[PDB]
Amino acid sequence: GSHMLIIIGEKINGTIPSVKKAIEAKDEKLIRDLALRQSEAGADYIDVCASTSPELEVETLQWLMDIVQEATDTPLCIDSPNPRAIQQVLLYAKRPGLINSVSLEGDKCEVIFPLIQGTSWQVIALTCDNSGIPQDVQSRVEIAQALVEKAQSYDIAQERIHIDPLVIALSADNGALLKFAEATRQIKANYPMINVTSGLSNISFGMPLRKVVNQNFLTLAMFAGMDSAILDPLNRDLLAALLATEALLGRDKHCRNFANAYRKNKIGPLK
Amino acid sequence: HMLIIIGEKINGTIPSVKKAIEAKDEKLIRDLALRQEAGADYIDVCASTSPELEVETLQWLMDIVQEATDTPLCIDSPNPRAIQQVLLYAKRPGLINSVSLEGDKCEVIFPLIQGTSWQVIALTCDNSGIPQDVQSRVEIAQALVEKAQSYDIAQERIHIDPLVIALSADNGALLKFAEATRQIKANYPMINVTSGLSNISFGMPLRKVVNQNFLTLAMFAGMDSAILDPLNRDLLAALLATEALLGRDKHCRNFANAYRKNKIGPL
Numbered sequence: 379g380s381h382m383l384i385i386i387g388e389k390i391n392g393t394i395p396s397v398k399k400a401i402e403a404k405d406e407k408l409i410r411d412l413a414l415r416q417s418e419a420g421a422d423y424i425d426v427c428a429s430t431s432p433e434l435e436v437e438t439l440q441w442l443m444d445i446v447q448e449a450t451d452t453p454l455c456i457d458s459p460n461p462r463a464i465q466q467v468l469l470y471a472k473r474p475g476l477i478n479s480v481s482l483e484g485d486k487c488e489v490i491f492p493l494i495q496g497t498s499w500q501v502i503a504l505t506c507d508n509s510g511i512p513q514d515v516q517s518r519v520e521i522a523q524a525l526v527e528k529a530q531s532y533d534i535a536q537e538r539i540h541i542d543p544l545v546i547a548l549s550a551d552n553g554a555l556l557k558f559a560e561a562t563r564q565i566k567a568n569y570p571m572i573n574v575t576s577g578l579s580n581i582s583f584g585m586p587l588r589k590v591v592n593q594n595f596l597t598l599a600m601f602a603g604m605d606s607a608i609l610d611p612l613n614r615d616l617l618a619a620l621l622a623t624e625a626l627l628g629r630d631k632h633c634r635n636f637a638n639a640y641r642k643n644k645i646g647p648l649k
Numbered sequence: 650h651m652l653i654i655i656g657e658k659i660n661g662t663i664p665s666v667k668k669a670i671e672a673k674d675e676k677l678i679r680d681l682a683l684r685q686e687a688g689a690d691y692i693d694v695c696a697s698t699s700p701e702l703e704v705e706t707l708q709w710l711m712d713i714v715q716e717a718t719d720t721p722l723c724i725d726s727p728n729p730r731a732i733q734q735v736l737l738y739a740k741r742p743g744l745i746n747s748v749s750l751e752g753d754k755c756e757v758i759f760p761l762i763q764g765t766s767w768q769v770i771a772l773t774c775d776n777s778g779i780p781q782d783v784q785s786r787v788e789i790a791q792a793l794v795e796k797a798q799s800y801d802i803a804q805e806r807i808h809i810d811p812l813v814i815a816l817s818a819d820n821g822a823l824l825k826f827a828e829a830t831r832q833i834k835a836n837y838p839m840i841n842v843t844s845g846l847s848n849i850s851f852g853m854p855l856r857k858v859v860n861q862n863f864l865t866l867a868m869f870a871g872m873d874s875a876i877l878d879p880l881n882r883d884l885l886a887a888l889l890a891t892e893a894l895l896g897r898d899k900h901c902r903n904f905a906n907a908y909r910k911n912k913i914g915p916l
């Protein structure tokens with residue numbers, strides 16, 4: 379039961395020097411422009427990540443959430459490695475979006491799951507635990523099962539969950555995409571209504587022409603069954619690959635979306 | 650295994666090549682042969698002239714190509730008699746492009762190659778034309794392999810081309826390509842499956858973008874060889890990145906070496 383890839387726009391992230399500077403400077407215009415441009419490029423969710431010191435995170439996420447929601451109604455994806463921070467900002471969202479993320483580490487599921495029980499929030503769940511990020515397929519598939527079982531005990535349906543198998547660098551494991559595809563097959567076999575999600579950038583660390591590698595990884599992971607991804611939709615070459623691959627996978631009737639993005643100059647040479 | 654690359658550029662349909670043929674421009678043909686350095690395993694040669702000029706044209710292109718490179722020839726003609734008349738001009742065995750169940754293509758070509766090391770591209774079509782489903786193509790592939798085995802031609806010498814059709818004509822074109830490839834290689838694990846890239850993107854804009862993403866998807870689906878333009882640097886980067894992503898480039902070295910030599914990446 380296939381569907382277009384769900385795009386989580388990654389650009390409002392304080393690890394990016396220009397955004398860290400905008401947060402320090404309180405430059406709303408930059409954040410507003412990234413929210414709007416990503417929405418216009420087709421993002422389904424706008425990721426927001428403070429990447430500041432811990433005791434500034436909550437107030438910075440609230441500031442980012444305010445600016446994004448003034449500019450656009452595209453729902454938020456709240457990105458924090460600190461579940462307490464997510465808890466403290468969830469009420470600032472005007473509508474339900476995505477929480478990024480829970481995992482089996484520490485008390486992430488004990489904090490976040492009661493937080494979204496009975497709501498329409500969706501959640502990204504990473505296949506990692508207190509021992510770290512496993513490289514092998516079996517361990518990640520077992521973590522996903524445990525996460526889905528813990529979510530079920532708060533009445534969170536599989537359709538609300540996006541499992542992120544945390545693909546590692548191809549230079550660290552040349553089987554990284556093969557394992558990604560095999561974990562995706564096994565997870566979806568167990569849970570046919572679940573989503574599988576990934577970032578695009580980790581795969582190319584340690585290789586030249588990262589943008590080339592990331593774009594080929596996207597195409598392969600889409601064919602392997604990826605449902606959502608955290609990516610940069612302002613990258614015109616990546617967007618042309620995404621839309622060509624949607625048409626090649628039979629998901630763009632009469633190739634109309636591809637033809638329209640070309641006609642509007644969203645992809646191809648900048649006119 | 651790494652994808653087998655049949656370099657497509659020496660084809661008289663391309664106006665610069667047509668003109669070089671008419672001028673006897675040797676340098677232009679040698680240069681395409683030698684540059685297709687880019688990794689080609691076979692150099693396609695296709696005259697694309699009138700019927701009565703094709704044999705002498707092919708002999709000229711084969712002569713000039715083999716002066717430039719020892720990379721073997723892929724002799725591309727729709728006329729099996731032309732292939733018969735030029736096979737002896739090759740200095741070493743290569744690929745014949747192509748046979749199919751149409752007319753007498755198998756009956757002319759297979760006796761010439763029986764007991765030799767020549768390989769052959771075999772298209773899934775017959776006298777009624779290009780087939781109208783996946784099943785028909787898989788059944789034609791089975792008939793081609795059986796005809797070939799009656800001349801002692803092993804499956805590893807055959808590259809079955811399932812003749813992918815334009816995505817704008819049928820939005821399932823790649824889904825069906827991948828299904829036929831999976832079924833053919835299930836029946837015959839030692840056979841190769843091959844394709845051209847360009848047909849898929851007919852009637853769409855940004856055809857090079859569509860061709861490149863079709864390459865990456867078809868490689869994951871199991872394609873073994875492809876006739877393509879390996880002088881297109883963006884296509885070669887995608888081809889090499891996809892080889893590394895499919896676990897076929899140990900420590901991503903071929904990719905890193907191609908970047909370090911400026912074979913891919915900004916000029």
Ligand SMILES: CN1c2c(nc(N)[nH]c2=O)NC[C@@H]1CNc1ccc(C(=O)N[C@@H](CCC(=O)O)C(=O)O)cc1
Pocket residue numbers: 388389391394457478479502542576577578579580589608610613616
């Ligand atoms: C680890 N990634 C990740 C995640 N969240 C989850 N669940 N999974 C993930 O893999 N959150 C953080 C990051 C995804 N976000 C980002 C954000 C920006 C860039 C980045 O490098 N941006 C550059 C280059 C963009 C491009 O290549 O087009 C930029 O200049 O904005 C990478 C990842």
Ligand SMILES: CN1c2c(nc(N)[nH]c2=O)NC[C@@H]1CNc1ccc(C(=O)N[C@@H](CCC(=O)O)C(=O)O)cc1
Pocket residue numbers: 657658660663725746747770810844845846847848857876878881
């Ligand atoms: C039908 N294609 C084909 C085949 N043989 C078989 N077995 N299968 C096939 O699909 N032989 C002919 C052709 C492949 N040959 C070619 C040769 C050149 C171009 C061509 O359009 N070349 C342009 C564009 C190059 C590019 O996109 O990089 C050129 O300028 O060279 C297309 C197909």
